[PDB]
Design an enzyme around this catalytic site. Structure first.
Site, PDB file in Angstrom:
ATOM      1  N   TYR A  45       0.831  -1.238   0.000  1.00 28.51           N
ATOM      2  CA  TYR A  45       0.000   0.000   0.000  1.00 28.51           C
ATOM      3  C   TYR A  45       0.859   1.280   0.000  1.00 28.51           C
ATOM      4  CZ  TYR A  45      -4.168  -2.799  -0.233  1.00 28.51           C
ATOM      5  OH  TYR A  45      -5.163  -3.604  -0.710  1.00 28.51           O
ATOM      6  N   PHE A  67     -11.276  -2.993   9.826  1.00 25.37           N
ATOM      7  CA  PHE A  67     -12.282  -2.985   8.735  1.00 25.37           C
ATOM      8  C   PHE A  67     -11.559  -3.404   7.452  1.00 25.37           C
ATOM      9  CE2 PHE A  67     -10.519   1.255   9.055  1.00 25.37           C
ATOM     10  CZ  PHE A  67     -10.202   1.539   7.747  1.00 25.37           C
TER      11      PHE A  67
END
Ligand SMILES: Fc1cccc(N/N=C/c2ccc(Cl)cc2)c1
Ligand SMILES: Fc1cccc(N/N=C/c2ccc(Cl)cc2)c1
Ligand SMILES: Fc1cccc(N/N=C/c2ccc(Cl)cc2)c1
Ligand SMILES: Fc1cccc(N/N=C/c2ccc(Cl)cc2)c1
Ligand SMILES: Fc1cccc(N/N=C/c2ccc(Cl)cc2)c1
Lengths: 390, 390, 390, 390, 390
Positions: B119, B390
């Protein structure tokens, strides 16, 4: 039982208690080298006849924030015979040595703790944090931004002078830095040799501004253990890690470092530098609160503020901090901050935040602004590290 | 292969890819609950016919330093079919979602990373740190100074309102805090029930200003796992730990917490709270540099200073910080600080020091004074925590 | 104790002995499905009253070299009560079933062995070799030469017909191939479903000419277990392995395959496909030596030769092999080759070399040229595999 | 950096790089013994000053199928400094040595690979297979058919001549056999002595036609490790295993052997000889394709056939095989078989089947009959073994 | 093969067989010390030429109930070459030595068993029980009732006389006690020295009426192993355990003791003394039933009773027990008790109850009252211990 300075006739009994008390006992010969760092009246023994108690301090030089070097009393070789537990021998030996250390003019004492629960009650607070990183070097790629051959694989015994020069610069600049005297360099380069049925041979990676000593683990032959990495520049620190990630026969490099070690950030995957272990390093007892607080530098960023600090059974002081300097004067004015001596030792090198000790109620104030100011003032610009175990 | 917003006919194929991609797949029913947090046009799929790529964002509310709440795009359910690796599907999906997130007006995006190496290149920097503590509670004694029965052992499903009220206060105040909506409370209290051949029953410890949910480990029956501890006061945090150390049938309590957790300092032996694990928590991508930098509070202790920040392919800004506020204006003046977008995300909640990223050369400046000022300004008074995955 | 064909009233007692004897007991319902493969008079029980002994055979179709399919008696559900060990019940049951199998006209019988030391004395020789490969897929790169999206990730229960068609082609061509009837496909796709406190959900990778069923391990969540990979072309076999190496959330792929599996050669590093386990697969008892030897094809490369084979208490035969065919006729001429029936079963599918059994003296000849000729003639062009356990 | 033949002044730097690169470093004294097998101009070093690269070859004699002995260049002591990775030093050293090896007239080169992924690109193919068997000897019973006191328990240092005579016969007959010179016998019988904190004492089992050297494991005291078993007759191989199964104080005997080792077949339970480990042994680079292909014998069983073999960047040849001999002549005719040099090395001793490499597409042909003919012709009558690591 | 008394020329071959047969081989020098305990004609060898079989006995003095010391033949150094298993060499050597031991006038023979299944058939019964206790000393608190500094931490080599005096008193009083001669004290204090790559240094805890030798484990550095604890009074036994629980750097103390060791009862938590291991210690063969039975004392508590004991192929005796003495006279009267010789050896020191051997049917009687009387009479007032392995 009687407490007194040992005679040359007491040392054989002290080596016996040492051998029985410390599995890592360096041995009588190595013990005689460290002994050159113990001043006259630096040691106490308890006799029953036989030695059942001992404790000593070494003359050390500790770097604190602002590159200030304090004379430091390093407690070591502390042992009570398994036959004389729960008879208050540790309390009696620590009290006698602290009296001597104070009278001798040491502003601080220090130690490495065999267990975490002993030394708090004698006023020692953990002041540095050891942080093991294990790198799975098979996956490690350096970031485009990482600096960098400047590094040479060398035999440690053939480059003592270069290591000593690098370590000396490193320590004059790193909070937690200790002067390493010649006898400890003698002992370091003797542990660099392979031992029959013991440790494997040590190699060094040498840069103009850094070195690493490493050895393959005796049991895990895919693990390299970095015993020591000292880098004075970021370039040196990166160049040395490039060389260590180049140990292509290894799966894992492990090092005991500090929490602010930039290694994770040199890699495209920060997660490859896993924290496998964390523990208290150096413990500090502030022997003289005003001398210690006035000696270190403080953050220039915090603006001038004044408060009243009480140390439990250690004094109450008007504390003024500004221009990165502190003045600490006696006062009977109401205390705005209260803490035990150990807590002060834990704040002193900037490894623990005052607001974190406040949250545990080890540190009491009714001013949240005062807490933020303490946090910011006691912070160290240069991250606190751990020089070497004693 | 084509990238587009999924239809109701695409979700069965997305659940299949989810089941195959995530071992922790909550399942279609639980997945349909979280789905209520995905806005219209919050999802992309790649079709070959069958779903081979998917990615979505959820509408979140993230607390940043100064108790400011930012609308936050939470990326989740990101998966490429094992059949379509190395075809640039992740790059295409991330680019499309980032375009939508930017156009929609989110100042920041966030995610939890399945691996540490993916990322960074898409501008995400790790912004919180998870820290597992394991306590050998058989040895744990509280310090004389520790606060503190105010705590009740209760069934979680019978005290949802009290947990929701405590969590809401906690999050409005803790950098990293996320608003937890009703559907996520539904999912939380469903995971609290014992599962056949699965997890054991969860208990709660409830204080007026804190709660802990814990369960015994399915395999290690002497290990209690604290799934969640939220304390709004120090008293609550101490009282809850007193109750957890009172689980006399357990050997070990483990919790995933943050590096500034005061628990070690509540004990006479700080070493009993062992750090067994450390990892990146929340990752941030600053979508809009000026909006993000102006939105958060800064340390009042640092004095007013001005500099020029360049983000690589993300703008150059005149940055003025004073009175704990920042103004960030466009400029063509020479940059004094340069860094990639990911690095900014890593500084933003105060979990990483600018001087540490500088040492890795992820952050370039020729002013050491500017570095100290950045470190001090971006520091968070309240320690940054991780709300929920999440 | 009496041996006889079971009644419908004996099956409850047989299910009890099965449950007690086989930890992997499919269960009465699943056991009733396999039961449809047992012919009338395919089962024996020993009664004391209660069932203390049982054994049965299933009607199978086994592919042998030259793509010839033999009717095969598959022994299964063989169990003696722990109360009736060392009373010769296994010898009595095996003798009765072998009599029935011979009289019924089966040229060969087969089984999977619970232990390696039981079945040799009853004339069974291990005829296939199971070979577990574990791939560390994090390092796996395909070779420039490797073929190859043609592969789809699919739900197994939605593609039964395609799997059945692929398996049918695979088995008509692979020595060791078994016809898989409808009831065994029913049982296969029922084991594909996730079980509460049991196995995780199964996924399939489907190519026009191949499939793989895999599931994540219940305990090791970084291990994918390939339960079955059937590829009719090399392209299919490579394409399926490309997809399996694309399971980026896994560290390791494990499969039970055969020793000639080309997977290692598809990778730049052959060593990444580690052999973690090896064991005997299918065992064969040649019931009728001439019928079995005449039924299979032989290597065209070996030139015509003639010899005399004696099987210990199993006949002596004039054996002529040429043009990949054998003629096996009765003779009283001096034997040139001697071996036990089990040894013949071990040579029959080409998994064991005659020269290797000769070196152990399981196979006796005074002609080294005859040994080389046997080795070459009994070799299988297509490598021998293991269809499925029964 | 410069590549050149080392001087006597370069060897100290080479021993340093060796010590740092190989955990199993025999040491300077042992290294000086092997050095007697390195010809003049058999070594290259890269200097920056200090040695950062080295590689050498030893003059070896390798037995190939048909009991033909080839002069063989054995690459060893190949090391790049961890400071000089990714600078093409291995490519430069391998190119220089290959040039010298070719010019010197070696038809083949060989090595043992530290990793499986390095040597393929330099034209080396794995040509032998190591196979660890572990026997639970508590259960081991010999088969009625097994041959067989002819075996004596002896001290290795008192029977060097008998071991040398047996090994010499063994190697003149086993594909993979290497001539073991006097210096390597010196090194072998020095490793037979017990080491302080190291390996335990070695014993030998001596038969007229075989020997085994074994030692108890340093950590597992119920494990015997067979370092070497050389048997010239089946009787010797069986007699030696009878003696090893007679080590009644051991639970397990482990040996590194070859896949065709008959031991499993000597036991009533073949499964007691578990394959615990498998790896590539010797790697071959065919330096001269025609010389290598003409030098070895081929299977008499395959009939005369002709084809055209292309080695990628290694020539195209008219290959005629008949009467167990090959003629390999230059041709510009269309290639019927194509493969890389490494693939040829992997076929050369008969450890890998051409049809298995074809299935991975490492070997391309449009004739399935040609593939079967290659498989049969390159097969070794005597199974290929691994002499000793270098 | 021939059995005979060894010559001085046979001992080199015996040391070779010893080295190969016993991983704990003390070595030729240490073996020459124990050899001083072997009488003239105390040894047999089997020659094929080379030594393939050996066995010897040592002249020992064993304490039995009532503080009676019996001349005892201690079998040791029993070894058959792995080349000569299953040829009845152990049966032939044991028969020859038993003949010599009987003719020489030993009432009993003894050994320590390498395996539990060998010595029963030669008439040896396990007569003592080894019991490892591991104490988690971190939790150990002594009971208010526990006695008790009287204990000194000392170097073993400086207090040999005090250890010898304590051991001598201990053994004259403890069933299982053996006289330890000077050569075995020489060997004991040589094993007390630290070994390179071997065992760590031994310490002693010395009380006027007890000692303990202990050493830290070579691998587990938190484990102390007590090699030997001899206490003549309860005070000494308690005082020594207080000192061992005072080894504050250890987590665990392990000792091999006997089942009646009072240590568990000295602690507030008896469960802290975990039984981690149990095994047969000394084995006895009663050579002369009447001499052995008349020699030991019996419990005064049982009243006078008479019975007829038959030992299988060992005689039938009128056995009268009263006033803690037995008379054992020849008789042809019907036997009331029957048992094998080994069973008698197992009863002889009081470690096994007659009623427990009766329950296994190793001991047959039709009188339950006779069984209770035997149990009570053969019971030892002082618990049976194990002196030292030979
Ligand atoms: F006689 C003396 C005087 C001073 C210190 C000592 N002990 N040495 C200290 C020490 C502590 C830790 C290590 Cl790793 C290595 C060494 C002995
Ligand atoms: F359909 C949707 C929409 C949004 C999120 C999801 N996945 N749920 C996310 C998640 C991540 C981690 C945990 Cl522990 C639990 C849950 C599925
Ligand atoms: F009643 C019957 C009739 C035939 C076979 C059986 N047992 N099933 C055999 C079997 C063997 C192995 C596996 Cl994995 C799965 C299944 C029961
Ligand atoms: F100076 C030289 C010249 C040739 C080879 C060597 N290294 N020895 C090779 C070797 C390789 C493996 C083993 Cl187990 C043992 C030894 C050193
Ligand atoms: F030559 C002889 C004569 C007598 C005994 C021996 N072996 N020593 C016996 C022995 C047994 C066990 C231990 Cl731990 C230590 C030693 C050798």
């Amino acid at each position: 039982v009687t407490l007194c300075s040992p005679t040359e006739d007491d040392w054989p009994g002290m080596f016996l208690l040492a051998a029985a008390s410390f599995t890592d006992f360096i041995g009588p010969e190595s013990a005689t080298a460290w002994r050159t760092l113990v001043p006259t009246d630096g040691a106490v023994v308890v006799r029953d006849s036989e030695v059942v108690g001992m404790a000593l301090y070494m003359d050390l030089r500790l770097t604190v924030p602002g590159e200030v070097v304090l004379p430091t009393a390093g407690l070591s070789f502390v042992a009570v015979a398994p036959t004389h537990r729960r008879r208050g021998l540790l309390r009696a030996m620590c009290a006698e040595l602290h009296r001597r250390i104070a009278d001798s003019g040491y502003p601080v004492a220090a130690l490495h703790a065999s267990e975490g629960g002993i030394y708090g009650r004698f006023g020692y607070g953990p002041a540095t944090t050891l942080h093991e990183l294990t790198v799975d070097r098979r996956f490690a790629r350096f970031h485009a931004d990482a600096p960098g051959s400047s590094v040479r694989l060398v035999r440690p015994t053939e480059h003592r002078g270069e290591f000593e020069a690098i370590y000396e610069r490193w320590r004059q600049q790193v909070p937690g830095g200790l002067l390493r005297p010649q006898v400890l360099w003698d002992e370091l380069l003797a542990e660099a040799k392979a031992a029959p049925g013991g440790d494997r041979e040590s190699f060094a990676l040498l840069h103009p501004d850094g070195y690493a000593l490493y050895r393959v683990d005796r049991t895990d032959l895919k693990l390299a253990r970095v015993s020591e990495l000292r880098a004075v520049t970021a370039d040196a620190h990166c160049a040395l890690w490039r060389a260590l990630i180049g140990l292509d026969s290894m799966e894992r490099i492990s090092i005991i470092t500090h929490p602010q070690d930039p290694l994770p950030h040199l890699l495209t995957d920060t997660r490859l530098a896993r924290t496998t272990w964390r523990q208290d390093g150096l413990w500090l007892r502030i022997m003289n609160v005003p001398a210690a607080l006035e000696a270190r530098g403080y953050a220039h960023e915090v603006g001038e503020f004044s408060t009243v600090l009480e140390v439990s059974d250690g004094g109450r002081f008007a504390l003024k901090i500004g221009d990165g300097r502190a003045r600490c004067t006696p006062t009977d004015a109401a205390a705005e901050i209260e803490m035990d001596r150990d807590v002060l030792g834990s704040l002193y090198l900037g490894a623990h935040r005052a607001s974190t000790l406040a949250a545990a109620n080890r540190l009491r104030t009714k001013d949240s602004q005062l807490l933020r100011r303490l946090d910011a003032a006691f912070a160290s610009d240069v991250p606190v590290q751990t020089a070497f175990e004693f």
